[PDB]
């Protein structure tokens, strides 16, 4: 689809930018749609780049995502935690599953949602199949549970809540309004 070209008039000269590159210049980063290896790595690259531009200024991570790949989401997470800049997070539209994980992972005090935003959390699911020998299925069953336990544990730390709270509240799809998300400890403020 067409992406509009925008003109920045930065003292003296003139530069044309696609509109997203323009917002990147103000340290705004988008995660929109499903989280994949490519969409996540693209985010990682922008965070690193913004840190190199100015390691002390906040970064503004805008999330509108239904979620996606767990390992892909984790590469974004670890980059957020690693880099020196505070990564503020903001939910517009929705933040579901890995989207909500990443939202909740923002620098505490700087996690936001727009007022009619939708947040959703649940336990890991798999699509497709584990097919094979019982030995192979057990192995993958165990790996899926390690992921579940880790995610519950990290979510508990993000929300400043008890592990047992997160375990019960992610058993099935848990939809939250912006206010419920704030009350839960998943975000800090509503804009």
């Amino acid at each position: 689809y067409l992406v509009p070209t925008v003109i920045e008039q930065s003292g003296r000269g003139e530069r044309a930018f696609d509109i997203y590159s323009r917002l990147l210049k103000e340290r705004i980063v988008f995660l929109v749609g499903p989280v994949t290896d490519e969409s996540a790595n693209l985010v990682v690259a922008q965070l690193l780049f913004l840190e190199s531009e100015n390691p002390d200024k906040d970064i503004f991570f805008y999330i509108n995502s239904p979620g996606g790949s767990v390992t892909a989401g984790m590469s974004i997470y670890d980059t957020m935690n690693f880099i020196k800049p505070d990564v503020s997070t903001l939910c517009l539209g929705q933040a579901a599953s890995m989207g909500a994980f990443l939202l909740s992972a923002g620098e505490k005090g700087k996690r936001f949602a727009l007022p009619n935003s939708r947040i959703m959390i649940h336990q890991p699911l798999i699509s497709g199949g584990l097919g094979g020998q019982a030995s192979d299925i057990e192995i993958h069953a165990r790996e899926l549970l390690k992921i579940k336990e880790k995610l519950n544990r990290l979510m508990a730390k993000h929300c400043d809540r008890d592990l047992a709270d997160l375990e019960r509240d992610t058993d099935r799809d848990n939809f939250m309004s912006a206010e419920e998300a704030k009350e839960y400890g998943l975000i800090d403020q509503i804009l």
């Binding site: 103000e26 340290r27 705004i28 906040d58 503020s88 903001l90 700087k110 936001f112 804009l191």
Partner: peptide, 6 residues
């Protein structure tokens, strides 16, 4: 979206 992001 500021304040404060940005």
């Amino acid at each position: 979206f500021s304040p404060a992001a940005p």
